[PDB]
Design a protein around this ligand. Structure first.
Ligand SMILES: O=P(O)(O)O[C@@H]1[C@@H](OP(=O)(O)O)[C@H](OP(=O)(O)O)[C@@H](O)[C@H](OP(=O)(O)O)[C@H]1OP(=O)(O)O
Ligand SMILES: Nc1ncnc2c1ncn2[C@@H]1O[C@H](COP(=O)(O)OP(=O)(O)O)[C@@H](O)[C@H]1O
Ligand SMILES: [Mg+2]
Ligand SMILES: [Mg+2]
Length: 215
């Protein structure tokens, strides 16, 4: 058994016994599985664009696509865009839960931040990408392109995305990047769209667009 280098969460996550798969234990209920299936049947396009593939279930374990698999030198950031259980967001509209090398910058997931500190932590996450500005702003722009489409699509989806995170990834060489939505354990059916979750994504798009544009 090989422990998966998580960025955040308390969940039991291991490498699969084969390439490109992780096993996440459903700790408290099978609700994450129920919600993958429900999204599979009602919003399959959403599942295809924005969510790691669910290959299968093994008792309490989900076999998930390893979002880090195709990266020589992956940098990962977990941002919670869904509602916290109780507790307000550490950055108002969202909470950064962790990032690759966040220890080196004295990052603390319990610390409520100003806009300045929030933006500095995202700048911190981007430092591994090096001083070549053209290729780091390409990463920012590919993230903005997918996040924009996600915020657009969220208006047409009647789910409360309580607890869901965005996983931002980029390779050290800035050759490759992505962002995807994870963690549906606390997602709920509702009769409208999720304005809190949409505001989290639009606020991130704002921050990233400010970085992509600064000189
Ligand atoms: O991620 P969602 O679901 O929102 O809730 C998590 C909660 O976050 P928030 O909701 O308070 O942000 C964490 O509290 P934090 O240390 O961040 O204050 C809990 O430690 C964690 O429960 P744990 O697994 O530790 O028992 C929850 O996950 P779960 O309920 O899916 O297990
Ligand atoms: N499919 C995935 N591929 C790669 N890393 C993942 C994947 N899903 C989760 N992770 C990693 O695991 C961490 C916790 O994921 P999450 O599903 O939110 O667990 P929890 O429900 O315990 O919060 C993330 O911060 C990320 O580092
Ligand atoms: Mg989580
Ligand atoms: Mg969870």
């Amino acid at each position: 058994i090989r422990i998966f280098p998580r960025i955040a969460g308390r969940s039991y996550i291991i490498y699969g016994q084969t390439s490109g798969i992780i096993c996440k234990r459903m700790e408290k209920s099978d609700n994450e599985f129920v919600i993958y299936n429900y999204i599979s049947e009602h919003y399959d396009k959403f599942l295809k664009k924005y969510v790691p593939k669910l290959y299968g279930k093994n008792n309490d374990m989900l076999l998930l696509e390893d979002l880090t698999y195709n990266y020589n030198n992956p940098n990962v950031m977990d941002v919670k865009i869904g509602a916290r259980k109780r507790k307000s967001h550490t950055s108002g509209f969202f909470s950064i839960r962790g990032y690759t090398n966040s220890h080196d910058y004295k990052f603390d997931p319990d610390e409520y931040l100003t806009s300045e500190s929030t933006i500095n932590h995202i700048k911190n996450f981007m430092e591994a990408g090096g001083e070549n500005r053209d290729k780091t702003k390409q990463v920012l722009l590919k993230w903005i392109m997918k996040l924009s489409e996600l915020a657009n699509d969220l208006f047409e989806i009647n789910l409360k995305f309580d607890g869901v995170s965005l996983i931002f990834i980029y390779d050290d060489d800035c050759s490759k990047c992505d962002v995807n939505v994870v963690d549906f354990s606390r997602v709920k059916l509702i009769d409208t769209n999720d304005q809190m979750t949409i505001s989290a994504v639009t606020n991130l798009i704002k921050i990233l667009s400010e970085l992509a544009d600064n000189p």
